[PDB]
Amino acid sequence: SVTQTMKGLDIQKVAGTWYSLAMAASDISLLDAQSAPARVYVEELKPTPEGDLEFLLQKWENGECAQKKIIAEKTKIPAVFKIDALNENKVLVLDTDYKKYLLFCWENSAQSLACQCLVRTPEVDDEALEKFDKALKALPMHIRLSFNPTQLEEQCHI
Amino acid sequence: SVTQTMKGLDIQKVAGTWYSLAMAASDISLLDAQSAPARVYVEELKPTPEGDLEFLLQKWENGECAQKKIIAEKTKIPAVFKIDALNENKVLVLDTDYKKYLLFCWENSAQSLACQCLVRTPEVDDEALEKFDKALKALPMHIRLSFNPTQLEEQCHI
Numbered sequence: 001s002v003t004q005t006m007k008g009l010d011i012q013k014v015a016g017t018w019y020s021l022a023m024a025a026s027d028i029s030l031l032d033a034q035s036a037p038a039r040v041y042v043e044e045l046k047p048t049p050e051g052d053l054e055f056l057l058q059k060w061e062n063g064e065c066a067q068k069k070i071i072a073e074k075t076k077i078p079a080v081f082k083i084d085a086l087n088e089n090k091v092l093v094l095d096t097d098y099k100k101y102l103l104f105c106w107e108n109s110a111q112s113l114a115c116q117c118l119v120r121t122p123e124v125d126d127e128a129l130e131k132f133d134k135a136l137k138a139l140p141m142h143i144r145l146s147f148n149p150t151q152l153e154e155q156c157h158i
Numbered sequence: 159s160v161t162q163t164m165k166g167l168d169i170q171k172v173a174g175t176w177y178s179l180a181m182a183a184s185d186i187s188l189l190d191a192q193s194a195p196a197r198v199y200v201e202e203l204k205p206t207p208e209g210d211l212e213f214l215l216q217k218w219e220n221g222e223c224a225q226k227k228i229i230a231e232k233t234k235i236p237a238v239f240k241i242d243a244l245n246e247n248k249v250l251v252l253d254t255d256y257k258k259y260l261l262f263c264w265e266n267s268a269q270s271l272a273c274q275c276l277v278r279t280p281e282v283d284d285e286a287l288e289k290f291d292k293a294l295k296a297l298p299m300h301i302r303l304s305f306n307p308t309q310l311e312e313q314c315h316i
Contacts, residue, residue: 028303031190032191032192034190142304142306143303144301
């Protein structure tokens with residue numbers, strides 16, 4: 001279970017452009033295939049005035065790169081959002097400095113977990129990846145992926 | 159380029175049973191799919207009297223788990239073997255204690271690299287994984303997988 005949250009998170013300040021630099025998951029099958037369920041690439045975070053968090057995503061499905069929009073609804077805890085879908089899915093914000101990196105996890109209630117290291121630019125931020133790997137020491141992850149700057153500038157990181 | 163080799167390697171002492179606990183590679187496509195080219199599971203190392211290193215492997219191909227035998231031929235350096243195939247492929251032994259763990263990499267001469275953490279038993283050896291992650295700090299890896307003890311006891315780690 002993810003216990004790591006961002007104290008004093010200001011959700012309006014995570015708005016805008018992000019790159020999915022690194023991804024990790026509890027199960028190999030969540031990230032292995034181009035089309036695996038957690039292989040989702042962030043384009044934009046769009047907080048609402050009410051304080052919900054909209055994700056603009058890309059996903060490989062039916063041999064191509066589709067736009068997806070997910071709304072994660074606010075809870076009583078600022079760093080935790082709930083995705084209305086068939087299953088009880090939580091989004092947790094682990095850590096961010098707003099200007100360079102943001103760490104988040106998706107988790108279900110069976111237990112499945114997928115986390116990402118987001119960065120503001122198409123660059124390999126070794127300090128952000130250090131914070132990401134420190135966070136995942138606490139988590140039972142079995143696959144980890146990372147992308148180069150060329151991939152980061154392509155649709156679905158091809 | 160892998161510069162890390164086992165000083166004073168005794169190849170006859172790596173004989174016998176091994177488990178592919180963890181795998182990492184330079185390119186996501188080498189390890190992502192059940193059938194990806196570097197997704198090969200070690201069963202046995204069989205040194206020859208002449209000092210060549212035979213690998214007994216499992217590989218997922220055509221929706222099933224096949225036996226494969228590879229011979230890596232000795233070179234003038236004890237920790238480096240050459241696989242006779244269409245391409246110039248090297249096997250490097252990075253580190254081993256013979257009794258618990260062995261770290262090795264396959265590399266080509268384009269550059270592609272795939273490494274594994276082998277262990278003698280179907281257990282998660284955190285100290286072996288620490289040595290594996292230390293070795294990979296020197297290498298440009300973009301995917302990392304690890305297996306649980308249940309998977310380690312199944313054909314092709316299903």
